[PDB]
PDB file of all heavy atoms in Angstrom:
ATOM      1  N   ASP A   1     -12.501  16.428  29.512  1.00 29.99           N
ATOM      2  CA  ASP A   1     -11.091  16.283  29.309  1.00 29.99           C
ATOM      3  C   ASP A   1     -11.032  16.040  27.814  1.00 29.99           C
ATOM      4  O   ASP A   1     -10.030  15.584  27.269  1.00 29.99           O
ATOM      5  CB  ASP A   1     -10.577  15.082  30.077  1.00 29.99           C
ATOM      6  CG  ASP A   1      -9.920  15.468  31.373  1.00 29.99           C
ATOM      7  OD1 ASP A   1     -10.648  15.774  32.337  1.00 29.99           O
ATOM      8  OD2 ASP A   1      -8.674  15.468  31.421  1.00 29.99           O
ATOM      9  N   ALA A   2     -12.158  16.330  27.170  1.00 27.80           N
ATOM     10  CA  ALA A   2     -12.285  16.349  25.705  1.00 27.80           C
ATOM     11  C   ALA A   2     -12.504  17.795  25.174  1.00 27.80           C
ATOM     12  O   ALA A   2     -13.556  18.431  25.444  1.00 27.80           O
ATOM     13  CB  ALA A   2     -13.393  15.389  25.223  1.00 27.80           C
ATOM     14  N   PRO A   3     -11.492  18.338  24.450  1.00 27.38           N
ATOM     15  CA  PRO A   3     -11.703  19.651  23.829  1.00 27.38           C
ATOM     16  C   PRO A   3     -12.790  19.586  22.775  1.00 27.38           C
ATOM     17  O   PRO A   3     -12.866  18.595  22.014  1.00 27.38           O
ATOM     18  CB  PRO A   3     -10.350  19.970  23.168  1.00 27.38           C
ATOM     19  CG  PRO A   3      -9.599  18.688  23.151  1.00 27.38           C
ATOM     20  CD  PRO A   3     -10.098  17.880  24.299  1.00 27.38           C
ATOM     21  N   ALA A   4     -13.627  20.626  22.753  1.00 27.62           N
ATOM     22  CA  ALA A   4     -14.536  20.853  21.630  1.00 27.62           C
ATOM     23  C   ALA A   4     -13.796  20.757  20.255  1.00 27.62           C
ATOM     24  O   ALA A   4     -12.701  21.290  20.102  1.00 27.62           O
ATOM     25  CB  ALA A   4     -15.223  22.207  21.804  1.00 27.62           C
ATOM     26  N   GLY A   5     -14.397  20.092  19.266  1.00 26.30           N
ATOM     27  CA  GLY A   5     -13.776  19.853  17.945  1.00 26.30           C
ATOM     28  C   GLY A   5     -13.214  18.427  17.874  1.00 26.30           C
ATOM     29  O   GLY A   5     -12.883  17.940  16.796  1.00 26.30           O
ATOM     30  N   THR A   6     -13.108  17.731  19.007  1.00 31.06           N
ATOM     31  CA  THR A   6     -12.623  16.334  18.951  1.00 31.06           C
ATOM     32  C   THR A   6     -13.543  15.356  18.209  1.00 31.06           C
ATOM     33  O   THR A   6     -14.717  15.375  18.412  1.00 31.06           O
ATOM     34  CB  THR A   6     -12.341  15.827  20.369  1.00 31.06           C
ATOM     35  OG1 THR A   6     -11.477  16.765  21.025  1.00 31.06           O
ATOM     36  CG2 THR A   6     -11.722  14.368  20.386  1.00 31.06           C
ATOM     37  N   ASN A   7     -13.014  14.524  17.318  1.00 30.07           N
ATOM     38  CA  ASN A   7     -13.768  13.323  16.834  1.00 30.07           C
ATOM     39  C   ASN A   7     -14.441  12.562  18.004  1.00 30.07           C
ATOM     40  O   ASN A   7     -13.864  12.456  19.039  1.00 30.07           O
ATOM     41  CB  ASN A   7     -12.875  12.366  15.997  1.00 30.07           C
ATOM     42  CG  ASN A   7     -12.376  13.026  14.750  1.00 30.07           C
ATOM     43  OD1 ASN A   7     -12.743  14.182  14.536  1.00 30.07           O
ATOM     44  ND2 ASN A   7     -11.533  12.326  13.894  1.00 30.07           N
ATOM     45  N   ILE A   8     -15.664  12.049  17.827  1.00 31.26           N
ATOM     46  CA  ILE A   8     -16.350  11.289  18.882  1.00 31.26           C
ATOM     47  C   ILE A   8     -16.056   9.846  18.583  1.00 31.26           C
ATOM     48  O   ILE A   8     -16.290   9.377  17.452  1.00 31.26           O
ATOM     49  CB  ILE A   8     -17.879  11.534  18.820  1.00 31.26           C
ATOM     50  CG1 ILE A   8     -18.219  12.939  19.283  1.00 31.26           C
ATOM     51  CG2 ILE A   8     -18.677  10.586  19.670  1.00 31.26           C
ATOM     52  CD1 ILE A   8     -19.651  13.175  19.156  1.00 31.26           C
ATOM     53  N   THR A   9     -15.539   9.121  19.584  1.00 32.00           N
ATOM     54  CA  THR A   9     -15.244   7.698  19.415  1.00 32.00           C
ATOM     55  C   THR A   9     -15.718   7.035  20.732  1.00 32.00           C
ATOM     56  O   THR A   9     -15.808   7.723  21.764  1.00 32.00           O
ATOM     57  CB  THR A   9     -13.716   7.488  19.285  1.00 32.00           C
ATOM     58  OG1 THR A   9     -13.127   8.030  20.465  1.00 32.00           O
ATOM     59  CG2 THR A   9     -13.072   8.166  17.972  1.00 32.00           C
ATOM     60  N   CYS A  10     -15.952   5.707  20.726  1.00 31.65           N
ATOM     61  CA  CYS A  10     -16.244   4.995  22.005  1.00 31.65           C
ATOM     62  C   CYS A  10     -15.377   3.756  22.240  1.00 31.65           C
ATOM     63  O   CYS A  10     -14.876   3.128  21.333  1.00 31.65           O
ATOM     64  CB  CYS A  10     -17.733   4.548  22.118  1.00 31.65           C
ATOM     65  SG  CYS A  10     -18.986   5.852  21.742  1.00 31.65           S
ATOM     66  N   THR A  11     -15.315   3.320  23.488  1.00 32.44           N
ATOM     67  CA  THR A  11     -14.581   2.131  23.714  1.00 32.44           C
ATOM     68  C   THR A  11     -15.548   1.025  23.339  1.00 32.44           C
ATOM     69  O   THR A  11     -16.763   1.273  23.226  1.00 32.44           O
ATOM     70  CB  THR A  11     -14.203   2.040  25.202  1.00 32.44           C
ATOM     71  OG1 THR A  11     -15.368   2.313  25.973  1.00 32.44           O
ATOM     72  CG2 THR A  11     -13.139   3.117  25.569  1.00 32.44           C
ATOM     73  N   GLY A  12     -15.018  -0.178  23.151  1.00 32.55           N
ATOM     74  CA  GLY A  12     -15.786  -1.396  23.309  1.00 32.55           C
ATOM     75  C   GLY A  12     -16.837  -1.454  22.226  1.00 32.55           C
ATOM     76  O   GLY A  12     -17.935  -2.013  22.478  1.00 32.55           O
ATOM     77  N   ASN A  13     -16.528  -0.852  21.056  1.00 29.78           N
ATOM     78  CA  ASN A  13     -17.408  -0.882  19.880  1.00 29.78           C
ATOM     79  C   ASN A  13     -18.868  -0.378  20.160  1.00 29.78           C
ATOM     80  O   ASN A  13     -19.781  -0.752  19.451  1.00 29.78           O
ATOM     81  CB  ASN A  13     -17.423  -2.283  19.281  1.00 29.78           C
ATOM     82  CG  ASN A  13     -17.922  -2.330  17.802  1.00 29.78           C
ATOM     83  OD1 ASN A  13     -17.863  -1.342  17.072  1.00 29.78           O
ATOM     84  ND2 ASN A  13     -18.375  -3.510  17.356  1.00 29.78           N
ATOM     85  N   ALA A  14     -19.047   0.466  21.169  1.00 30.23           N
ATOM     86  CA  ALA A  14     -20.336   1.078  21.520  1.00 30.23           C
ATOM     87  C   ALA A  14     -21.014   1.959  20.499  1.00 30.23           C
ATOM     88  O   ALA A  14     -22.237   2.095  20.545  1.00 30.23           O
ATOM     89  CB  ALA A  14     -20.216   1.849  22.764  1.00 30.23           C
ATOM     90  N   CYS A  15     -20.267   2.520  19.559  1.00 27.74           N
ATOM     91  CA  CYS A  15     -20.822   3.535  18.713  1.00 27.74           C
ATOM     92  C   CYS A  15     -20.244   3.678  17.322  1.00 27.74           C
ATOM     93  O   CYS A  15     -19.968   4.773  16.892  1.00 27.74           O
ATOM     94  CB  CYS A  15     -20.853   4.889  19.440  1.00 27.74           C
ATOM     95  SG  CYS A  15     -19.299   5.736  19.598  1.00 27.74           S
ATOM     96  N   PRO A  16     -20.103   2.558  16.599  1.00 28.43           N
ATOM     97  CA  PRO A  16     -19.400   2.591  15.322  1.00 28.43           C
ATOM     98  C   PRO A  16     -20.056   3.425  14.256  1.00 28.43           C
ATOM     99  O   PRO A  16     -19.345   3.934  13.344  1.00 28.43           O
ATOM    100  CB  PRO A  16     -19.412   1.118  14.847  1.00 28.43           C
ATOM    101  CG  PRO A  16     -20.639   0.440  15.644  1.00 28.43           C
ATOM    102  CD  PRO A  16     -20.505   1.185  17.005  1.00 28.43           C
ATOM    103  N   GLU A  17     -21.390   3.533  14.278  1.00 29.01           N
ATOM    104  CA  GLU A  17     -22.046   4.438  13.297  1.00 29.01           C
ATOM    105  C   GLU A  17     -21.722   5.878  13.546  1.00 29.01           C
ATOM    106  O   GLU A  17     -21.630   6.633  12.603  1.00 29.01           O
ATOM    107  CB  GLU A  17     -23.545   4.292  13.257  1.00 29.01           C
ATOM    108  CG  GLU A  17     -24.014   2.918  12.866  1.00 29.01           C
ATOM    109  CD  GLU A  17     -23.589   2.440  11.513  1.00 29.01           C
ATOM    110  OE1 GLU A  17     -23.678   3.187  10.529  1.00 29.01           O
ATOM    111  OE2 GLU A  17     -23.212   1.263  11.407  1.00 29.01           O
ATOM    112  N   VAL A  18     -21.552   6.269  14.792  1.00 26.74           N
ATOM    113  CA  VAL A  18     -21.205   7.657  15.128  1.00 26.74           C
ATOM    114  C   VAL A  18     -19.765   7.889  14.742  1.00 26.74           C
ATOM    115  O   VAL A  18     -19.391   8.969  14.204  1.00 26.74           O
ATOM    116  CB  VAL A  18     -21.398   7.930  16.619  1.00 26.74           C
ATOM    117  CG1 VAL A  18     -20.860   9.300  17.050  1.00 26.74           C
ATOM    118  CG2 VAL A  18     -22.870   7.685  16.992  1.00 26.74           C
ATOM    119  N   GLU A  19     -18.982   6.846  14.929  1.00 23.83           N
ATOM    120  CA  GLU A  19     -17.548   6.858  14.507  1.00 23.83           C
ATOM    121  C   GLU A  19     -17.335   7.008  13.014  1.00 23.83           C
ATOM    122  O   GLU A  19     -16.516   7.784  12.605  1.00 23.83           O
ATOM    123  CB  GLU A  19     -16.741   5.649  15.049  1.00 23.83           C
ATOM    124  CG  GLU A  19     -16.428   5.804  16.535  1.00 23.83           C
ATOM    125  CD  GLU A  19     -15.478   4.745  17.064  1.00 23.83           C
ATOM    126  OE1 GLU A  19     -14.780   4.148  16.195  1.00 23.83           O
ATOM    127  OE2 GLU A  19     -15.426   4.551  18.334  1.00 23.83           O
ATOM    128  N   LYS A  20     -18.080   6.268  12.215  1.00 25.33           N
ATOM    129  CA  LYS A  20     -18.021   6.427  10.757  1.00 25.33           C
ATOM    130  C   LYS A  20     -18.451   7.830  10.256  1.00 25.33           C
ATOM    131  O   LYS A  20     -18.251   8.153   9.097  1.00 25.33           O
ATOM    132  CB  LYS A  20     -18.971   5.439  10.077  1.00 25.33           C
ATOM    133  CG  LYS A  20     -18.513   3.974  10.112  1.00 25.33           C
ATOM    134  CD  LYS A  20     -19.216   3.141   9.032  1.00 25.33           C
ATOM    135  CE  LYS A  20     -19.126   1.633   9.365  1.00 25.33           C
ATOM    136  NZ  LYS A  20     -20.308   1.263  10.237  1.00 25.33           N
ATOM    137  N   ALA A  21     -19.117   8.618  11.081  1.00 26.74           N
ATOM    138  CA  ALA A  21     -19.573   9.891  10.606  1.00 26.74           C
ATOM    139  C   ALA A  21     -18.562  10.949  11.008  1.00 26.74           C
ATOM    140  O   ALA A  21     -17.680  10.734  11.895  1.00 26.74           O
ATOM    141  CB  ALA A  21     -20.945  10.215  11.157  1.00 26.74           C
ATOM    142  N   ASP A  22     -18.712  12.100  10.363  1.00 27.73           N
ATOM    143  CA  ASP A  22     -17.864  13.204  10.642  1.00 27.73           C
ATOM    144  C   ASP A  22     -18.516  13.894  11.825  1.00 27.73           C
ATOM    145  O   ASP A  22     -19.212  14.929  11.639  1.00 27.73           O
ATOM    146  CB  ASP A  22     -17.673  14.076   9.371  1.00 27.73           C
ATOM    147  CG  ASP A  22     -16.961  15.462   9.653  1.00 27.73           C
ATOM    148  OD1 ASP A  22     -16.404  15.693  10.782  1.00 27.73           O
ATOM    149  OD2 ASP A  22     -17.012  16.312   8.730  1.00 27.73           O
ATOM    150  N   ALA A  23     -18.305  13.343  13.038  1.00 30.94           N
ATOM    151  CA  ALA A  23     -18.956  13.928  14.225  1.00 30.94           C
ATOM    152  C   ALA A  23     -17.991  14.270  15.320  1.00 30.94           C
ATOM    153  O   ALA A  23     -17.070  13.479  15.557  1.00 30.94           O
ATOM    154  CB  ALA A  23     -20.022  13.009  14.761  1.00 30.94           C
ATOM    155  N   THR A  24     -18.247  15.365  16.062  1.00 30.15           N
ATOM    156  CA  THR A  24     -17.270  15.955  16.956  1.00 30.15           C
ATOM    157  C   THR A  24     -18.042  16.600  18.090  1.00 30.15           C
ATOM    158  O   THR A  24     -19.205  16.972  17.919  1.00 30.15           O
ATOM    159  CB  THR A  24     -16.471  17.078  16.220  1.00 30.15           C
ATOM    160  OG1 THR A  24     -17.410  17.911  15.573  1.00 30.15           O
ATOM    161  CG2 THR A  24     -15.599  16.587  15.038  1.00 30.15           C
ATOM    162  N   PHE A  25     -17.431  16.748  19.255  1.00 29.02           N
ATOM    163  CA  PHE A  25     -18.128  17.370  20.387  1.00 29.02           C
ATOM    164  C   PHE A  25     -18.247  18.864  20.107  1.00 29.02           C
ATOM    165  O   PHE A  25     -17.339  19.403  19.545  1.00 29.02           O
ATOM    166  CB  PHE A  25     -17.354  17.138  21.704  1.00 29.02           C
ATOM    167  CG  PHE A  25     -17.227  15.678  22.090  1.00 29.02           C
ATOM    168  CD1 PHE A  25     -16.047  14.975  21.839  1.00 29.02           C
ATOM    169  CD2 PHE A  25     -18.274  15.016  22.707  1.00 29.02           C
ATOM    170  CE1 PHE A  25     -15.934  13.611  22.190  1.00 29.02           C
ATOM    171  CE2 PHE A  25     -18.179  13.651  23.053  1.00 29.02           C
ATOM    172  CZ  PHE A  25     -17.015  12.946  22.779  1.00 29.02           C
ATOM    173  N   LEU A  26     -19.362  19.510  20.459  1.00 28.30           N
ATOM    174  CA  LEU A  26     -19.474  20.958  20.398  1.00 28.30           C
ATOM    175  C   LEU A  26     -19.393  21.479  21.784  1.00 28.30           C
ATOM    176  O   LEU A  26     -19.044  22.643  21.957  1.00 28.30           O
ATOM    177  CB  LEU A  26     -20.780  21.469  19.789  1.00 28.30           C
ATOM    178  CG  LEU A  26     -20.915  21.403  18.266  1.00 28.30           C
ATOM    179  CD1 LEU A  26     -22.369  21.743  17.804  1.00 28.30           C
ATOM    180  CD2 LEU A  26     -19.882  22.251  17.522  1.00 28.30           C
ATOM    181  N   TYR A  27     -19.758  20.639  22.763  1.00 31.35           N
ATOM    182  CA  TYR A  27     -19.748  21.028  24.189  1.00 31.35           C
ATOM    183  C   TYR A  27     -20.085  19.792  25.024  1.00 31.35           C
ATOM    184  O   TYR A  27     -21.052  19.088  24.706  1.00 31.35           O
ATOM    185  CB  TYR A  27     -20.725  22.207  24.449  1.00 31.35           C
ATOM    186  CG  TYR A  27     -20.877  22.583  25.908  1.00 31.35           C
ATOM    187  CD1 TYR A  27     -19.766  23.027  26.659  1.00 31.35           C
ATOM    188  CD2 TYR A  27     -22.129  22.473  26.561  1.00 31.35           C
ATOM    189  CE1 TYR A  27     -19.904  23.359  28.025  1.00 31.35           C
ATOM    190  CE2 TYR A  27     -22.271  22.801  27.916  1.00 31.35           C
ATOM    191  CZ  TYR A  27     -21.150  23.231  28.629  1.00 31.35           C
ATOM    192  OH  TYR A  27     -21.260  23.546  29.950  1.00 31.35           O
ATOM    193  N   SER A  28     -19.281  19.525  26.062  1.00 31.81           N
ATOM    194  CA  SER A  28     -19.430  18.364  26.950  1.00 31.81           C
ATOM    195  C   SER A  28     -19.792  18.847  28.301  1.00 31.81           C
ATOM    196  O   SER A  28     -19.249  19.859  28.729  1.00 31.81           O
ATOM    197  CB  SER A  28     -18.140  17.591  27.090  1.00 31.81           C
ATOM    198  OG  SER A  28     -17.866  16.867  25.914  1.00 31.81           O
TER     199      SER A  28
END
């Protein structure tokens, strides 16, 4: 329910380093 190209974020502070980066789903 996440389109490819979306910023990757997590709830509950699970992934702040991934959040600080320019990262996006290519395929889920």
Side-chain angles (χ1 to χ4, degrees):
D1 260 77
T6 308
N7 297 358
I8 289 177
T9 58
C10 311
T11 48
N13 199 23
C15 75
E17 299 300 315
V18 172
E19 285 188 20
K20 288 200 199 88
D22 170 12
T24 48
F25 298 100
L26 283 171
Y27 174 61
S28 287

